[PDB]
Amino acid sequence: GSVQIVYKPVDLSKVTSKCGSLGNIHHKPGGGQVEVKSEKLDFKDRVQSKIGSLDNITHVPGGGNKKIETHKLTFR
Amino acid sequence: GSVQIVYKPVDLSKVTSKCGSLGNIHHKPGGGQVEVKSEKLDFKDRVQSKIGSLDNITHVPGGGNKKIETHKLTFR
Amino acid sequence: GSVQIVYKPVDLSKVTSKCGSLGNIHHKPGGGQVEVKSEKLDFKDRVQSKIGSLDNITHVPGGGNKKIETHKLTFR
Amino acid sequence: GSVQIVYKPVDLSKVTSKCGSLGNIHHKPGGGQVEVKSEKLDFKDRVQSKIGSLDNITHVPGGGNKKIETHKLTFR
Amino acid sequence: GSVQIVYKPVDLSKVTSKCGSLGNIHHKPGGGQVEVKSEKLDFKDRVQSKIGSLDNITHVPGGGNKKIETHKLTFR
Amino acid sequence: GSVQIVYKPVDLSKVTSKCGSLGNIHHKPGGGQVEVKSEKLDFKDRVQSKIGSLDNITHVPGGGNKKIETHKLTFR
Amino acid sequence: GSVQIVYKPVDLSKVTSKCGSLGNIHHKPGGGQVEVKSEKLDFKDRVQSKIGSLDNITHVPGGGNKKIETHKLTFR
Amino acid sequence: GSVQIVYKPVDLSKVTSKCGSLGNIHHKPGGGQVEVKSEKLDFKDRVQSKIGSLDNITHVPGGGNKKIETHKLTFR
Amino acid sequence: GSVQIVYKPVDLSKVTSKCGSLGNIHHKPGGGQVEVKSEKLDFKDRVQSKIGSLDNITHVPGGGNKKIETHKLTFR
C-alpha cells in the first residue's frame, strides 16, 4: 500500500564540563602475577576474547565527555 | 494500506558539570595474583569473553559526562 | 504500493569541555608477570582476540571528548 | 698464687642428615609495596639494620646442618 | 704467681649430609615498588645497613653445611 | 711471675656433602621500581651500607659447605 | 629342624574330542559404524587402553581343546 | 637346619582331537567405518595404547589344541 | 645348614590332531574406512602405541597346536 515513514529526530542537546586546575595524580601499581593455564582454544563466528591481560591505566582527559547515538530504521 | 508513521523525537536536554580544583589523587595497589586453570574453550556465535585479567585503573576526567541514545523503528 | 521512507535526522548538538592547567600526573608501574600456557588455537570467521598482553598506559588528552553516531536504514 | 688451669673439652659429636629426592618447591610472591617516610636518622655503635626493604628468599640446602662453638678462657 | 694454662680442646666432630636428586625449584617474584623518603642520614661506628632494597635470593647449595668455632684465651 | 701458656687446640673435624643431580632451578623476578631520597648523606667508621638496591641472586654451589675458625690469644 | 617338602603330583589325564564334518559356517555381519569424539588424552603410570576398535572374528578350530596348569611351591 | 625340597611332578597327559572335513567357512562382513576424533595425546610412563583399529580375522586351524604349564619353585 | 633342592619334573605328555580335508575357506570383507583425526602426540618412556591400523588375516594351519612350558627355580 501507500506506506509512509518519516524519520526526523531533532537534536539540540549539549554535553559540557568546566573544570579548574586538574592534576597532582599519582598511580603506583605494586606488580603481581596473571596466569592462565588451558587446553586447545576453539573460537567460531563473531567471538570477541581477552585472556591473561595485565593493565595499568592512568587516564586524565581535561574534558572526557561522551555522546553516543544509534539511529536505526529497518523495513521489510 | 495507507499506513503513516512519523518519528520525530525532539531533544533539547543538557548534561553539564562544574568543578573547582580536581586533584591530589593517589592510587597505590598492593600487587597480588590472578590465576585461571581450564580445559578446552569452545566459544560459538556472538560470544564476548575476558579471562584472568588484572587491572589497575586511575581515571580522572575533568568532565566525564555521558549521554547515550538509541532511536529505533522496525517495520514488517 | 507507493512505499516512501524519508530519513532526515537533524543534529545541531555539541560536546564541549573547558579545563585550567592539566598536569603533574605520575604513573610508575612496578612490573609483574603475565603468563598464558595453552594447546593449539583454532579461531575461524570474524574472531577478535588478545592473549598474554602487559600494558602500561598514560593518557592525558587536553580535550578527550567523543561523539559517536551510527545512522542505519535497511530495506527489503 | 701458683694457679693451674687445664682446658681440654673433647668433642666427638656428629650432626648428620640423609635425604631422598628434594624438590618440587615453588615460591611465587605477588609483589606489593614497602614504604618508609621519616625525619633525620642518627644510628650509632654496632647496629645491624634493614629499612623499608622487600625480600624474597628461597633457600634449599641439601644439607643445611649447623654446628657452632665458642670456647673462652679468661684469666686475671 | 707461677701460673700455668693448658688449652687443648680436641675436636673430632663431623657435619655431614647425603642427598638424592635436588631440583625442580621455582622462584617467581612479582616485582613492586619500594620507597624510603627521609632527611639527612648520620650513621656512625660498625653499622651494617640496607635501605629501600627490593631483593630476590635463590640459594640451592648441594651441601650448605656450616661449622663455626671461636677459640679465645685472654691472660692478664 | 713464672707464667706458662700452651695453646694446642687439635682439630680433626670434617664438613662433608654427597649430592645427586643438582638442577632444574628457575628464578624469574618480575622487575620492580625503587626510590631512596634524602638530603646529602654522612656516614663514618667501619660501615657496611646498601641504598636503593634492586638485587637478584641465584647461587647453586655443589658443595657450599663452610668452616670458620678464630684462634685469638691475648697476653698482657 | 630338618624341614622337608616333597612335591610329586602325578597327572595321567586326557582332554579329547571327536567330530564329524565341521563346516557350512557363515559369518556375514551387516557392517556398521564405530565413532569416538574426544578431547586431549592424558594417560600416566601403567595405563592400558583401547579406543574405537571394530572386530569381525571367525574362529573354527577342528580341535580347540585346552589344558592349563600352574604348579607353584614357595619357601621362606 | 637340613632343609630339603623335592620337585618331581610326573605328566603323562594328552590333548587330542579327531575331525572330519573342515571347510565351507565363509567370512563376509559388510565393511563399516571406524572414526576417532581427538585433541593432543599425552602418554607418560608404561602406557600401552591402541586407537581406531579395524580387524577381520579368519582362523581355521586343523587342530588348534593347546597345553600350557608354569612350574615355579621360589626359595628364601 | 645343609640346604638341598631337587628339580626333576618328568614330562611325557602329547598335543595331537587329526583332520580330513582342510579347505573351502573364503574371506571377503566389504572393505570399509578407518579414520583418526588428532592434534600433536607427546609420548615419553615405555609408551607402546598403535593408531589407525586396518587388518585382514586368514590363518589356516594344518596343525596349529601349541605346547608351552615355563620352568623357574629362584633361590636367595
Numbering used by the authors:
A (entry chain G), B (entry chain E), C (entry chain C), D (entry chain F), E (entry chain H), F (entry chain A), ...: 304 to 379
Quote the study's own text.
The first reaction was carried out in the presence of magnesium chloride for forming PHFs, whereas the second contained sodium chloride for forming CTE filaments. During the next 3 h, additional types of filament formed. Again, most filaments comprised two protofilaments that packed against each other in various ways. Some filaments with three or four protofilaments also formed, including the previously described triple and quadruple helical filaments. Finally, by 720 min, most filaments had adopted the same ordered core as that of PHFs extracted from the brains of individuals with Alzheimer’s disease, although triple helical filaments remained in some replicates. Other models of secondary nucleation include: maturation of filament types through the sliding of protofilaments relative to each other; growth, association and/or dissociation of protofilaments at the sides of filaments; and formation of new filament types by partial structural templating at the end of, or at defects in, existing protofilaments.
Residues 297–391 (using the numbering of the longest human brain tau isoform) constitute the proteolytically stable core of paired helical filaments (PHFs) from the brains of individuals with Alzheimer’s disease. Here we use time-resolved cryogenic electron microscopy to study the in vitro assembly of recombinant truncated tau (amino acid residues 297–391) into paired helical filaments of Alzheimer’s disease or into filaments of chronic traumatic encephalopathy. At later time points, the first intermediate amyloid disappears and we observe many different intermediate amyloid filaments, with structures that depend on the reaction conditions. At the end of both assembly reactions, most intermediate amyloids disappear and filaments with the same ordered cores as those from human brains remain.
